[PDB]
Design an enzyme around this catalytic site. Structure first.
Site, PDB file in Angstrom:
ATOM      1  CG  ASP A  82      -2.028   1.067   1.021  1.00 50.21           C
ATOM      2  OD1 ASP A  82      -2.259   1.471   0.053  1.00 50.21           O
ATOM      3  OD2 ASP A  82      -2.341   1.507   2.229  1.00 50.21           O
ATOM      4  CG  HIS A 136      -7.923  -0.594  -5.049  1.00 56.24           C
ATOM      5  ND1 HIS A 136      -9.267   0.232  -4.738  1.00 56.24           N
ATOM      6  CD2 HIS A 136      -7.341   0.091  -4.514  1.00 56.24           C
ATOM      7  CE1 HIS A 136      -8.882   1.135  -3.879  1.00 56.24           C
ATOM      8  NE2 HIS A 136      -7.695   1.190  -3.800  1.00 56.24           N
TER       9      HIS A 136
HETATM   10  C1  HEM Z   1      -9.576  -1.523   2.273  1.00 54.29           C
HETATM   11  C2  HEM Z   1      -9.310  -0.403   1.729  1.00 54.29           C
HETATM   12  C3  HEM Z   1      -8.026  -0.019   0.793  1.00 54.29           C
HETATM   13  C4  HEM Z   1      -7.148  -1.160   0.423  1.00 54.29           C
HETATM   14  C5  HEM Z   1      -6.635  -2.321   1.036  1.00 54.29           C
HETATM   15  C6  HEM Z   1      -6.348  -0.222  -0.621  1.00 54.29           C
HETATM   16  C7  HEM Z   1      -5.044  -0.767  -1.133  1.00 54.29           C
HETATM   17  C8  HEM Z   1      -4.289  -0.195  -2.032  1.00 54.29           C
HETATM   18  C9  HEM Z   1      -3.554  -0.996  -2.869  1.00 54.29           C
HETATM   19  C10 HEM Z   1      -2.808  -2.163  -2.553  1.00 54.29           C
HETATM   20  C11 HEM Z   1      -2.824  -0.070  -3.889  1.00 54.29           C
HETATM   21  C12 HEM Z   1      -1.861  -0.243  -4.752  1.00 54.29           C
HETATM   22  C13 HEM Z   1      -0.453   0.369  -4.272  1.00 54.29           C
HETATM   23  C14 HEM Z   1      -0.467   1.803  -4.318  1.00 54.29           C
HETATM   24  O1  HEM Z   1      -0.183   2.387  -5.306  1.00 54.29           O
HETATM   25  O2  HEM Z   1      -0.690   2.475  -3.260  1.00 54.29           O
HETATM   26  C15 HEM Z   1      -3.704   1.184  -3.620  1.00 54.29           C
HETATM   27  C16 HEM Z   1      -4.031   2.304  -4.391  1.00 54.29           C
HETATM   28  C17 HEM Z   1      -4.609   3.362  -4.302  1.00 54.29           C
HETATM   29  N1  HEM Z   1      -5.706   3.471  -3.680  1.00 54.29           N
HETATM   30 FE1  HEM Z   1      -6.514   2.134  -2.332  1.00 54.29          FE
HETATM   31  N2  HEM Z   1      -6.939   0.794  -0.832  1.00 54.29           N
HETATM   32  C18 HEM Z   1      -8.168   0.918  -0.276  1.00 54.29           C
HETATM   33  C19 HEM Z   1      -8.735   1.883   0.069  1.00 54.29           C
HETATM   34  C20 HEM Z   1      -8.974   3.033  -0.884  1.00 54.29           C
HETATM   35  C21 HEM Z   1      -9.954   4.126  -0.877  1.00 54.29           C
HETATM   36  C22 HEM Z   1     -11.106   4.289  -0.075  1.00 54.29           C
HETATM   37  C23 HEM Z   1      -9.500   5.138  -1.618  1.00 54.29           C
HETATM   38  C24 HEM Z   1      -9.849   6.478  -2.224  1.00 54.29           C
HETATM   39  C25 HEM Z   1     -11.004   6.876  -1.790  1.00 54.29           C
HETATM   40  C26 HEM Z   1      -8.141   4.588  -2.405  1.00 54.29           C
HETATM   41  C27 HEM Z   1      -7.225   5.148  -3.238  1.00 54.29           C
HETATM   42  C28 HEM Z   1      -6.138   4.659  -3.761  1.00 54.29           C
HETATM   43  C29 HEM Z   1      -5.407   5.386  -4.842  1.00 54.29           C
HETATM   44  C30 HEM Z   1      -5.616   6.678  -5.420  1.00 54.29           C
HETATM   45  C31 HEM Z   1      -4.390   4.640  -5.132  1.00 54.29           C
HETATM   46  C32 HEM Z   1      -3.372   4.916  -6.142  1.00 54.29           C
HETATM   47  C33 HEM Z   1      -3.700   4.724  -7.565  1.00 54.29           C
HETATM   48  C34 HEM Z   1      -2.923   4.628  -8.818  1.00 54.29           C
HETATM   49  O3  HEM Z   1      -2.879   5.886  -9.148  1.00 54.29           O
HETATM   50  O4  HEM Z   1      -2.107   4.110  -8.952  1.00 54.29           O
HETATM   51  N3  HEM Z   1      -8.023   3.397  -1.675  1.00 54.29           N
HETATM   52  N4  HEM Z   1      -4.688   0.914  -2.714  1.00 54.29           N
END
Ligand code: HEM
Ligand SMILES: [Mg+2]
Length: 301
Positions: A144, A216
């Protein structure tokens, strides 16, 4: 004649945090001196523990911020709505305290200080202790943070309001997720990877046209005429091995718009499809807050 950002928005890689969410029990005036005492306490802790690299944020819900501001600025602020007709529940509180540093023990002292400053003026609804897990992975085993804005310059561009009455401030979104790891472990690793949009072990991005639209990354990597809707995440794992555990989601943005667009996307309000992560985890809280600049916390009186 400029604005200073609160210390807890921009720090990167802090290994621990504490989030306190609370309701205002009396006259909103109580929040004025309390908030000033709290930011002074933070300065004191930063002086006593320079190696903790401590930062903190005090942020306010729509109703109390409209009262403290006299309705000036914070034009996007509103109570957190329900998304997906309830898929994302809503638990809008009046006050958010976010503490983060290299040392949980220092965070704990700061949290006690916050509680002593506000005292019986607030009703604590949630207190969550976040911790960075091995390789900065979420408890699902996926890294993450990879595409999070990197460096103070870019994080400021994304998170900090640049001018006007709100210069130095930020919008904050908090959402606690409860993971069902047993349900996750029923899924094959390839199925999990298609659910996230990155490979699990090596954390390689799966191309947009190889991965489902429900992945996601497909839900939250949004662009408007090629410009990404970026946010600064400060999320951390939390919980016990045998009890409730998951991700405490936390994001800062100069514009609430970027956050809301990602939520409409994840919860099915945009194209009728929803985030594949809802197959093993679910959100149980939700709130929007306004983090004023440090000097406006000093113009509270
Ligand atoms: C259980 C809840 C969540 C988990 C386990 C989770 C997990 C992850 C993971 C594994 C990544 C990929 C690695 C990274 O680039 O950080 C990611 C990316 C991201 N997450 Fe989440 N996330 C969650 C919730 C959320 C929520 C609620 C939002 C926004 C409202 C969010 C927004 C984002 C964004 C903007 C990225 C980067 C995407 C990109 O530009 O590549 N996430 N998340
Ligand atoms: Mg991308």
């Amino acid at each position: 004649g400029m604005s200073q950002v609160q210390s807890g928005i921009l720090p990167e890689h802090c290994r621990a945090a504490i989030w306190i969410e609370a309701n205002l029990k009396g006259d909103v005036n109580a929040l004025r001196e309390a908030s000033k005492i709290f930011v002074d306490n933070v300065a004191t802790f930063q002086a006593k523990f320079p190696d903790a690299k401590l930062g903190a944020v005090v942020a306010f819900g729509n109703n109390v911020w409209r009262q403290l501001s006299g309705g000036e600025g914070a034009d996007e602020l509103k109570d957190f709505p329900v998304y997906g007709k309830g898929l994302a529940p809503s638990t809008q509180y009046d006050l958010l305290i976010h503490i983060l540093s290299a040392r949980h023990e220092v965070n704990f002292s700061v949290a006690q200080a916050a509680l002593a400053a506000f005292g019986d003026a607030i009703d604590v609804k949630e207190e969550i202790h976040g911790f960075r897990w091995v390789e900065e992975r979420d408890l699902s085993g996926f890294v993450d943070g990879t595409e999070n804005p990197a460096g103070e310059e870019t994080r400021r561009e994304v998170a900090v309001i640049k001018d006007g009455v709100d210069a130095g401030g930020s919008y904050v979104f908090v959402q606690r997720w409860e993971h069902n790891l047993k349900q996750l472990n029923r899924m094959s690793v390839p199925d999990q990877e298609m659910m996230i949009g990155r490979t699990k072990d090596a954390n390689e991005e799966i191309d947009g046209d190889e991965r489902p639209v429900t992945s996601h990354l497909s839900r939250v990597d949004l662009k408007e005429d090629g410009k990404g809707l970026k946010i600064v995440r400060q999320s951390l794992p939390y919980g016990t091995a045998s009890g409730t555990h998951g991700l405490y989601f936390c994001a800062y943005c100069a514009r609430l718009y970027n956050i809301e667009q990602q939520l409409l996307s994840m919860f099915g309000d945009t194209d009728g499809k929803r985030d594949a992560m809802l197959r093993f985890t679910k959100p149980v809280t939700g709130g929007y807050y306004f983090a004023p600049s440090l000097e406006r916390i000093q113009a509270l009186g």
